[PDB]
Design a protein around this ligand. Sequence first.
Ligand SMILES: [Fe+3]
Ligand SMILES: [Y+3]
Length: 291
Amino acid sequence: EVIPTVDISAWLSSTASPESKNKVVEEVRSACNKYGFFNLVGHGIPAEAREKIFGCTKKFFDLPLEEKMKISVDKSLGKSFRGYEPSLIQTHQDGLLPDTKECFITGAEIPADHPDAGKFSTGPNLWPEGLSDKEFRQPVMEYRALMLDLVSTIVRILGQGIHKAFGHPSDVLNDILINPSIPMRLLHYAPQENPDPRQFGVGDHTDFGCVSILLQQKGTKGLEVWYPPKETWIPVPVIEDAFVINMGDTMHRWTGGYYRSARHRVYITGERRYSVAFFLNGNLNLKIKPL
Ligand SMILES: [Fe+3]
Ligand SMILES: [Y+3]
């Protein structure tokens, strides 16, 4: 068992044959129904954009810890959960140790005086005073835009797989793109030579939202996915020019389980590891209804 790779070039091309485009819908619906994950290529985002966001991520986490804590998540407006979260505080199971993960959290930018500001994960972002807009904020928000565009493509492909499966309009799912809740996290995993097997980078979880898009770093590993049929954890290989796509619980319930939300985690390694995780959640008003 291996996590598959799906090339969406045809679906984004305006000259590809309808056969080529359907083949993309087949490979996607199928990976999401069997593994809940795939690797995605053919997205059209340049290698520069991926280089630039890891530049931002390293600059940020290289900051002094007192410097990051100045925008610690507990300082964000109300229930906007934005800013810096340090390592060794997130836990998953009582027998185990907290996660080595260090993370920085953004969402869609909303002025402080907006009506929804302060509500759950909606409001303004917190930005580090010690970095210039040009070093950090502008690239981060530009990458967010590229991610929003890609996840909108992914959603419409999923909707088309729903059409083929159960006969619904191929825009069943497109209402989550209306004013979406789209957090992203910049992730840092400090390396360890001899790690305790009771501690992970991130422990066994599912994602709660709809779609997640992950950018891993060339030369690292750690991400693995639980596949019930063989009762095994499958590794997710770092593919060149790829994003890792998985389904969340909201998509699970909202389909019949047809798109699976699969358990996954990141074990600790000796190599320093960065990743950028962007997620698409259900809306703040949208009552998500099954089939
Ligand atoms: Fe996750
Ligand atoms: Y205003």
